[PDB]
């Protein structure tokens, strides 16, 4: 060894001379020796530290198409990339643009030497990201996703993950290169844990993108990610779940979701809190405005599973909020909505749902819960139970608070109206009044509502500048007007004047309810 870092050093200028030889026959001889001088502790640091070498070696690899020297050279750089000095040395000689050129090599051993070295550079060499992007490694790597060696694909997809992370430039190019569809293809074809994991990471990164999102969805990403939710690997399952939650708001138009939806429902009974949370989140977005998904979730026991999720979550609002939102979506506008409304009651959900209206619940959960209660009230069998649990007094109380807050802002807190815990009080005013409108279909509920002296407030809400509020207020007043005593109170309260003006509202809903109140009040 005492002559390695002494003779090889005096040998460096030697082989370096041969690598630049014009004779395409002996240049191969050095390539072999040089490669050998990459396996010894000394020779390695000899060439690696010999800028002259690195440069020639790199130039050789790319130039000589000789399917024999291409690997000796490529094989040299790779041995150097296991050392920081090597990575840096390779980076300075411009090896990256070369290595990227070799990604097109039909000689597997060269291909493998290229992708593994680039991976090392992208993993520990600052500046590598720019260079690879510069040389156009992105489109190259996306093209190589058509290969079938799984360890190779795992390396390649990891590189793409490194290059894409937090960079829309790379992401755009990946998209244009047809990356999404290729990535989804891998998820539905292979079973090599490491590969699925690394690929799910690239998808996770792209799923937070605006342009990549709808692309992954169209490629069938939802269904494919859904294939691995039952896999033994926890990191794979969790990565698929996060990516799925990100895509879920742009996948409300997909077909063949039966399998995914059924799996999500069963995932609600998981021992892992994090899986439960994501699952509820994903179901909430997939059942928003999609009657088909709503019918499916209900069909596989979604209602019972969600009520159980709410019970198990306790005071953990990151779980109850989306679970309660899903339940809201499932209890209206679809063929089985009525079955869903009944099932919530049959599975002992009414008590827990009304309790959520009380502290320690914060506003976002409260807002979601008021909406669910409005839907539950569409089922006449839920009126007495909802009333027994104290729903009306709490809804009215919430209504009064939110309305006053909007009054302490009619002056100037900041702007027209801002938020409180992420919720505008105008939405609580609308939600509560809307819940009371439906509940008021019941004669007994009307007695309670009227008894709390709400008519004066409801009338003032007709002057609200917010159309949706004017509409639910007129709505609840119309329901209450069917009782003579309430009808006289509404009139004594001066509702006729404002109702008469609302007949001209630009909002059909508002004009209709206003007119309905007046008719109910006329023909008594």
């Amino acid at each position: 060894y005492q002559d390695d870092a002494e003779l090889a050093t005096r040998a460096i200028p030697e082989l370096t001379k041969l690598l630049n030889d014009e004779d395409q026959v002996v240049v191969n001889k050095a390539a072999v020796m040089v490669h050998q001088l990459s396996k010894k502790e000394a020779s390695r640091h000899a060439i690696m530290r010999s800028p002259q070498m690195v440069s020639a070696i790199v130039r050789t690899m790319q130039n000589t198409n000789d399917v024999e020297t291409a690997r000796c050279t490529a094989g040299t750089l790779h041995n150097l990339s296991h050392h920081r000095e090597g990575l840096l040395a390779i980076f300075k000689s411009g090896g990256i643009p070369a290595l990227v050129k070799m990604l097109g090599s039909p000689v597997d051993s060269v291909l493998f030497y290229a992708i593994t070295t680039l991976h090392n550079l992208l993993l520990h060499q600052e500046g590598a990201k720019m260079a690879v992007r510069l040389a156009g490694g992105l489109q190259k790597m996306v093209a190589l996703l058509n290969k079938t060696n799984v360890k190779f694909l795992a390396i390649t997809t990891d590189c793409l993950q490194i290059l894409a992370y937090g960079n829309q430039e790379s992401k755009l190019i990946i998209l244009a290169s047809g990356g999404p569809q290729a990535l989804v293809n891998i998820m539905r074809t292979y079973t090599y844990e490491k590969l699925l994991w690394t690929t799910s990471r690239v998808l996770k990164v792209l799923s937070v993108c605006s342009s990549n999102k709808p692309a992954i969805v169209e490629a069938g990403g939802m269904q494919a990610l859904g294939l691995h939710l039952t896999d033994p690997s926890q990191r794979l399952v969790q990565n698929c779940l996060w990516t799925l939650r990100n895509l879920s708001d742009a996948a409300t138009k997909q077909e063949g979701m039966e399998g995914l939806l059924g799996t999500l429902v069963q995932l609600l009974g998981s021992d892992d809190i994090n899986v439960v949370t994501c699952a509820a989140g994903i179901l909430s977005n997939l059942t928003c405005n999609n009657y088909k998904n709503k019918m499916m979730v209900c069909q596989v026991g979604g209602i019972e599973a969600l009520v159980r999720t709410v019970l198990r979550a306790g005071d953990r609002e990151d779980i109850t909020e989306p679970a309660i939102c899903a339940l809201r979506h499932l209890t209206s506008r679809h063929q089985e909505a009525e079955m869903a409304q009944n099932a919530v009651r049959l599975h002992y959900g009414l008590p827990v749902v009304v309790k959520l209206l009380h502290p320690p619940s914060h506003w976002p959960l409260i807002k979601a819960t008021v909406g669910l209660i409005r839907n539950l009230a569409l089922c006449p069998a839920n009126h007495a139970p909802l009333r027994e649990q104290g729903a009306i007094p709490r809804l009215v109380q919430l209504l009064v608070r939110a309305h006053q807050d909007t009054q302490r802002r009619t002056s100037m807190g900041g702007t027209q109206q801002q938020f409180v815990e992420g919720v505008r009080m105008e939405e609580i005013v609308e939600g509560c009044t809307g819940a009371l409108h439906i509940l008021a279909r019941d004669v007994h509920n009307r007695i309670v509502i009227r008894g709390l002296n709400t008519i004066p407030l409801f009338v003032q809400l007709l002057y609200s500048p917010i159309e949706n509020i004017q509409r639910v207020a007129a709505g609840v007043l119309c329901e209450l007007a069917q009782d003579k005593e309430a009808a006289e109170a509404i009139e004594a309260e001066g509702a006729t004047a404002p109702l008469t003006e609302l007949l001209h509202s630009r909002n059909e809903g508002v004009a209709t309810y206003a007119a309905a109140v007046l008719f109910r009040m006329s023909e008594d």
């Binding site: 597997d108 991976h119 360890k151």
Partner: peptide, 17 residues
Amino acid sequence: EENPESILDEHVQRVMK
């Protein structure tokens, strides 16, 4: 002698698991 697939197998062995 050595299968040009050991290059990947080895790499994977060190970068991750």
